[PDB]
Design a protein around this ligand. Structure first.
Ligand code: ZN
Ligand code: ZN
Lengths: 66, 262, 98, 30, 115, 147, 49, 135, 20, 503
């Protein structure tokens, strides 16, 4: 859905690197591990947040209400 | 002079250092006040003028509540509980306005820099939204397309971390002492070997190995700490260290003066 | 040495909630029984049209995450797309009170 | 080769084709 | 709902002080002090540093239950010497030590300062 | 409940100033009693937690695969060369004072989920309320304030 | 929901025997889940493909 | 008024681990009283022991019902407190073996010992005692 | 041994793109 | 039945419980919304006049609150509207209704009742954060884990009833069950494990702990015990500190299989004058037993001091276990490889002797043991062989298992699990079965359609080879499900039948 704010585990600001984490896939053909490396969350406590978030808001918003 | 202190590595956002000739209770209390009583400012009360999105309104509120703000001059303003006024005077709070519009054919984003300062800032550097990326975007809020409107009146008052994590600046901590088990406060689990079934500390090199055969040092005591504190960035890290020290000392002075009043 | 047939995969003797049980060999069977009973009473998301699809009872959480563990099947159960709960960090400690 | 035998990993594609054909509610629908 | 309210985390209660002293009768020169609205922050530190000084005799502190932000503390000392003055001396030692810590940290971080 | 049948409820909530915490400060989300384990014989929960931790450090997602060949040994060696304990135990600290802790703790990421029977539909109390006309007794139903 | 579409249900009566089909049988392989049974007075009655 | 009531040099035979990590077990014989026999529990690490180690033991009735204990108060204490292993506990049972050798078993809190000797058969001790061991 | 704890799919797609 | 010997009631409460280690047995935790909702009549005397007047002025919201007042005649004036609020003088001979202030007597229920238990009385300390709260002690006679079960509560109205609940249905004279001629209360799993940790000889403790526990015990005399060992440092044994919590003049003897007064194997238990001397606290001494410690103190000293005894040792073991910390993990479960291959070859030679016996059967020459039939004797031989294989394997695994193994610590510490549990989860399972016979020839000529015809091998019928940890084969998975489903169906029928016969 929306990638949330402030990790339950650590609590730093999360989601700055979110669409960045996207574009380190398509136009770079870049593996996710080194992508998270150069992304730069040296803990894992935040790394899991983006590793298991699933977007839903796209499927939400591609209705046409009103 | 007593508690000598030595730095290891500094940045904009995380500080790791050495604390020596101190006591375990002192360090633990430092950690607790560090995560608990550092006053700041954040958005607390929200006024939804009109919502249209595919999200809920209090949903948007709790989403808003975690956006940190500029926190330098936070001492200047006053708590609403102690303030003599009612309903958020300029001395005790700030005002936030957010505007979005469904303009494009494609989907639209809202970044946390789109919110603006509203009321009298009175020159104290307060309440700007933090940007961290290369592209000036405070972290995402909600997504819209072509038809939806949000008008947000928001009021931000003081708050502290101990009653809600909204006002927490810390959001990380690190803590180490006796990396090499010399104080022997605890053994290790093992199935065949204590050594190989565990990895070394990263703090290994600053204290010598335990000499391998000398008798158990009994009259030793805890010292030589390793503190790495990584703040959120709503307020600088040196400032949060010194201000945690400040609020601890003011608390202890308050209890002392209450005692001498009694 | 006289076979005529082999199964596609031994993992596919199960059922719907039975897919969701991670490593379902590695426990005891009545635990699987309570798990299949329990999974029907989980919230999360149920459809996507819920801004319009009125009904009496409806339970939607906020932040649904696909589980870190999974088997291959609930990819086909679309459960990766629409999850039940979210991960957390659990601890095993008799921490003295509660 | 294309005429080689089949490793245990491979059958998931067979499952993919089978579900894309039938669907889960195939019993009621049929 | 009419539970006791949420201002019991940090705010003072009206008509009631930050503390109430109380005299025991169990041992000579033995008293207990009631604290509330705080926690192990002050608790562990005050107990450890009052233990460090050795003119005083015995101490310990505990919380009754986590649902209430209050805790107690039990002090006795030898004759003539007094618990209240002893702990106020302890508090002055605390504030002096940490003030030295603060100024030394400030100087350390300034002498760090990059470039 | 868990993914293995560990139902119950919540005792209390502390905050981070006295939750248990590690060297990297990874404060936990929830804590339960070890006495669930050697009675309900739920090894699957533990192996799920360990594979979950190695998945989190890897970045690759995991695998369950009911009848396959993934073993604790491979999991152990992988997470070992990722630089942690070979089994999942961990140095850990006191919540209150931060002294060392005697034992060590298996602790990490795991998948939970939420049930439906929330407390507000089950709390119910009554005194001197409505009367049923057939029997002059208190009526049924939490809805109409029964007994 | 994707569980509840594929349900099956037999009638038996009030008490019944036990070797009679209240408990599972070897014939059930590859067809019905040997775990996903409901609990309480009807275990071994409802079963899932 | 506080005096030793039994004191001699004792020679350990050997030491048993007892599958623990801070305590062990000692058994020892007198040089002088060949009738007498000694066994004793010990915190093994905090004073290490070995085979063929001569040791000395001491009754130490008191140090000159005791009140609440005082923190050790580092000034000079002209007591029986200047050997190493100082250790306090409680007696519970008296034994008569061979019609001659009396036997008593004291305790130390969670520690035990066995003690023999038939010369001092009234001078020996009674309900609680101390212990002193040198070097 | 390799023991296959994890697997790849679209790389093998591209391998068959060169194979065919 | 639904109207005369049972019916609906008034003054009722129904929520879900959580444990707590700080509330003793005669209390109970009650949530404040429920305290507002309930009531209880009092009377107006010269004694209660001022407190009742103050609580009437407090209005119907503030927690020591009132809702109804009753004057001489049939008078029900309700305080909610009550525009003459601060004006009633509250004359003698009257009745007021108030909320539940604390330590009121109150009767407790849990469905479904079986025996004299489930009916305790309690006092009350009123608690916020709405739910119930009660002592971890009384849990097993209540026969309810925390799996979401709900409770039932009632409040007496008059003084006779309140007094007789107070004097009869309170806990401290229900410590021993009359039905089972042995006490059925008990300190339970977590504190039991912790006290087994504490009682060990090898451990000790420091000042900062021992002063804190000595303040933690509510009835401590203001006297510290002496140092147990002095030389560089005061230290104490867990036995030494627990002897404070044990009240004086209590004596017990255990003397089982070691216990030559200088216990090498450290079993047994002996207490003189309320002080521990030696031994290892364990459930077979300190839990519910025939010669129980609780039995002893209740029968001798007087059956309410035991309540504070649970309070004392429960609080102390809890607070020490806090800073100690304790847990388990997979590293308990996995064991040594040479022992693994010994398990393997043990099962293998069992299979070999099974094969030899089957060959002897297949060449028609056998004993044909007396009483039963040829095939029945064959079944007896194979069952006996495999069971000896299973428990010999379990014995080998347990004796290999280490002394810092935490689940071994758990099981020989008591509370939960067993040797059978450890062996079952670690080495092998043994042949699952239904009604003694192993898994029947469902399909023709064979067991499951996946083997060749006409076999009686341990694989064929499905003796379970592997442990849990290494995994299963699908056949073993299926047989395991068979046995479990049999257990479930027999339980779900026997519950209705036993309910009928009990009624
Ligand atoms: Zn994080
Ligand atoms: Zn104001």
């Amino acid at each position: 859905m929306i990638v949330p704010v402030r990790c339950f585990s650590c609590g730093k600001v999360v989601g700055d690197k979110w669409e960045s984490y996207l574009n380190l896939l398509q136009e770079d053909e870049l593996d996710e591990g080194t992508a998270l490396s150069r992304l730069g969350l040296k803990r894992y406590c935040c790394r899991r947040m983006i590793l298991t978030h699933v977007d839903l808001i796209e499927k939400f918003l591609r209705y046409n209400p009103l | 002079e007593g508690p000598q202190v030595k730095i290891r590595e500094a940045s904009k956002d995380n500080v790791d250092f050495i604390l020596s000739n101190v006591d375990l209770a002192m360090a633990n209390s430092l950690r607790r006040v560090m995560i608990a009583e550092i006053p700041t400012l954040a958005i607390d009360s929200v006024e939804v003028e009109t919502n249209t999105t595919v999200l809920a309104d209090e949903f948007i509120a709790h989403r808003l509540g975690l956006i940190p703000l500029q926190s330098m001059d936070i001492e200047q303003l006053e708590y609403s509980r102690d303030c003599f006024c009612e309903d958020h005077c300029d001395k005790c709070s700030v005002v936030l306005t957010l505007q979005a519009f469904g303009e494009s054919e494609s989907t639209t984003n809202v970044y946390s820099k789109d919110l603006v300062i509203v009321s009298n800032l009175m020159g104290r550097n307060i309440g700007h939204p933090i940007i961290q990326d290369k592209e000036g975007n405070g972290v995402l809020i909600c997504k819209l397309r072509k038809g939806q409107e949000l008008k947000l009146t928001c009021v931000a008052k003081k708050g502290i971390a101990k009653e809600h994590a909204k006002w927490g600046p810390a959001a990380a901590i690190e803590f180490e002492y006796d990396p090499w088990n010399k104080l022997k406060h605890t053994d290790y689990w093992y199935e065949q070997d204590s050594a190989k079934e565990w990895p070394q500390s990263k703090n290994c090199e600053y204290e010598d190995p335990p000499n391998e055969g000398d008798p158990f040092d009994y009259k030793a005591q805890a010292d030589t700490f390793y503190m790495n504190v990584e703040s959120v960035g709503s307020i600088p890290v040196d400032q949060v260290v010194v201000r945690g020290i400040d609020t601890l000392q003011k608390k202890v002075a308050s209890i002392l003066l209450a005692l001498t009043q009694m | 040495t006289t076979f005529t047939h082999c199964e596609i995969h031994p993992s596919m003797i199960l059922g719907v909630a039975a897919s969701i049980i991670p490593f379902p060999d590695h426990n005891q069977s009545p635990r699987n029984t309570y798990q299949s009973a329990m999974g029907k009473q989980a919230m999360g998301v149920f459809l996507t049209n819920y801004n319009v699809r009125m009904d009496t009872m409806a339970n939607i959480l906020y932040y649904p995450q696909k589980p870190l563990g999974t088997t291959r099947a609930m990819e086909y159960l679309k459960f990766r797309e629409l999850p039940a709960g979210q991960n957390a960090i659990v601890a095993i400690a008799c921490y003295s009170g509660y | 080769d294309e005429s080689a035998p089949i490793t245990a990993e491979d059958s998931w594609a067979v499952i993919s084709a089978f579900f894309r054909e039938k669907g889960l509610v195939s019993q009621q629908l049929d | 709902m009419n539970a006791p309210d949420r201002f019991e985390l940090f705010l003072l209660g009206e008509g009631e002080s930050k503390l109430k002293i109380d005299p025991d009768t169990k041992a000579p020169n033995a008293v207990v002090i009631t604290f509330e609205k705080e926690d192990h922050t002050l608790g562990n530190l005050i107990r450890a540093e009052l233990l460090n000084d050795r003119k005083v005799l015995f101490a310990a502190y505990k919380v009754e239950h986590p649902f209430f932000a209050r805790f107690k503390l039990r002090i006795q000392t030898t004759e003539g010497y007094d618990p209240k003055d002893a702990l106020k001396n302890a508090c002055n030692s605390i504030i002096n030590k940490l003030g030295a810590l603060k100024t030394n940290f400030e100087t350390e971080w300034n002498l760090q300062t990059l470039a | 409940a868990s993914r293995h049948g560990q139902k119950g409820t919540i005792g209390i909530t502390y905050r981070r100033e006295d939750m248990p915490f590690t060297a990297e400060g990874i404060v936990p989300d929830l804590i339960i009693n070890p006495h669930a384990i050697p009675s309900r014989m739920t090894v699957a929960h533990l192996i799920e937690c360990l594979l979950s931790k190695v998945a989190a450090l890897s970045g690759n997602e995991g695998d369950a695969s009911p009848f396959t060949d993934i073993t604790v040994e491979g999991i152990s060696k992988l997470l070992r060369e990722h630089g942690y304990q070979s089994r999942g135990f961990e140095v850990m600290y006191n919540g209150h004072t931060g002294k060392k802790l005697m034992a060590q703790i298996f602790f990490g990421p795991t998948y939970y989920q939420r049930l439906r029977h929330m407390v507000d539909d089950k709390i119910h109390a009554r005194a001197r309320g409505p009367m049923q006309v057939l029997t002059r007794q208190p009526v049924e139903g939490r809805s109409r304030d029964g007994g | 929901t994707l569980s509840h579409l594929r349900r099956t249900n037999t009638p038996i009566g009030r008490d019944g025997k036990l070797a009679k089909p209240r408990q599972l049988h070897n014939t059930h392989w590859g067809l019905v889940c040997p775990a996903e049974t409901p609990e309480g007075q009807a275990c071994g009655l409802v079963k899932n493909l | 008024m506080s005096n030793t009531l039994f004191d001699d040099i004792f020679q350990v035979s050997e030491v048993d681990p007892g599958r623990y990590n801070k305590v062990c077990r000692i058994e020892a014989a007198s040089t002088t009283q060949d009738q007498c026999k000694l066994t004793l529990d010990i915190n093994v690490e905090l004073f290490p022991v070995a085979a063929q180690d001569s040791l000395t033991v001491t009754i130490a009735s008191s140090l000159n019902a005791t009140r609440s204990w005082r923190p050790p108060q580092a000034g000079d204490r002209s007591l029986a407190d200047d050997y190493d292993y100082v250790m306090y506990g409680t007696a519970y049972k008296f034994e008569e073996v061979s019609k001659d050798l009396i036997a008593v078993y004291y305790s130390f809190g969670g520690l035990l010992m066995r003690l023999e000797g038939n010369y001092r058969n009234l001078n020996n001790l009674q309900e609680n005692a101390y212990l002193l061991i040198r070097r | 041994t390799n023991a296959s704890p994890f697997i790849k799919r679209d790389r093998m797609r591209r391998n068959f793109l060169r194979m065919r | 039945r639904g109207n005369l010997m049972g019916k609906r009631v008034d003054f009722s409460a129904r929520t879900v419980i959580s444990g707590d280690p700080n509330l003793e047995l005669d209390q109970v935790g009650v949530p404040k919304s429920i305290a507002k909702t309930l009531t209880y009549p009092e009377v107006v005397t010269p004694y209660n006049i001022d407190r009742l007047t103050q609580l009437v002025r407090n209005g119907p919201n503030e927690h020591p609150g009132a809702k109804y007042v009753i004057r001489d005649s049939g008078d029900r004036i309700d305080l909610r509207y009550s525009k003459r609020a601060g004006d009633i003088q509250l004359q003698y001979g009257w009745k007021v209704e108030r909320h539940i202030m604390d330590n009121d007597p109150v009767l407790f229920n849990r469905q479904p009742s079986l025996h004299k238990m489930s009916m305790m009385a309690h006092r009350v300390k009123v608690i916020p954060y709405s739910t119930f709260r009660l002592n971890l002690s009384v849990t097993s006679p209540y026969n309810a884990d925390f799996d979401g079960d709900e409770m039932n509560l009632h409040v007496p109205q008059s003084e006779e009833t309140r007094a007789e609940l107070s004097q009869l249905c309170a806990v401290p004279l229900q410590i021993v069950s009359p039905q089972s001629n042995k006490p059925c209360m008990g300190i339970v799993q977590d504190t039991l494990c912790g006290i087994r940790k504490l009682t060990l000889r090898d451990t000790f403790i420091e000042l900062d702990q021992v002063l804190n526990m000595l303040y933690w015990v509510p009835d401590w005399d203001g006297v510290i015990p002496t140092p147990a060992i002095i030389k560089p440092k005061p230290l104490w044994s867990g036995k030494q500190i627990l002897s404070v919590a044990i009240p004086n003049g209590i004596h017990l003897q255990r003397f089982d299989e070691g216990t030559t007064l200088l216990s090498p194997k450290d079993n047994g238990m002996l207490i003189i004058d309320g002080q521990i001397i030696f031994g290892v606290v364990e459930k077979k001494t300190v839990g519910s037993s025939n010669g129980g410690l609780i039995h002893v103190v209740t029968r001798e000293k007087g059956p309410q001091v035991c309540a504070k005894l649970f309070g004392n040792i429960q609080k102390v073991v809890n607070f020490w276990l806090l800073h100690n910390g304790f847990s388990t993990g997979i590293g308990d479960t996995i064991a040594d490889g040479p022992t693994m291959r010994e398990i393997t070859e043990t099962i293998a030679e069992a299979k070999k002797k099974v094969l030899d016996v089957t060959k002897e059967a297949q060449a028609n020459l056998l004993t044909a043991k007396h009483g039963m039939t040829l095939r029945e004797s064959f079944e007896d031989n194979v069952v006996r062989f495999l069971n000896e294989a299973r428990d010999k394997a379990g014995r080998l695994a347990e004796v290999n298992l280490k002394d810092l193994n935490n689940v071994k610590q758990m099981v020989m510490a008591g509370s939960k699990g067993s040797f059978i549990n450890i062996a079952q989860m670690s080495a092998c399972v043994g042949q699952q079965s239904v009604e003694g016979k192993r898994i029947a020839f469902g399909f023709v000529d064979r067991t499951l359609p996946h083997f060749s015809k006409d076999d009686y091998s341990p694989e064929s019928k499905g003796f379970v080879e592997n442990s849990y940890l290494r995994g299963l084969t699908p056949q073993e998975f299926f047989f395991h499900a068979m046995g479990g489903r049999e257990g479930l169906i027999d339980t779900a029928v026997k519950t209705a039948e036993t309910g009928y016969i009990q009624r």
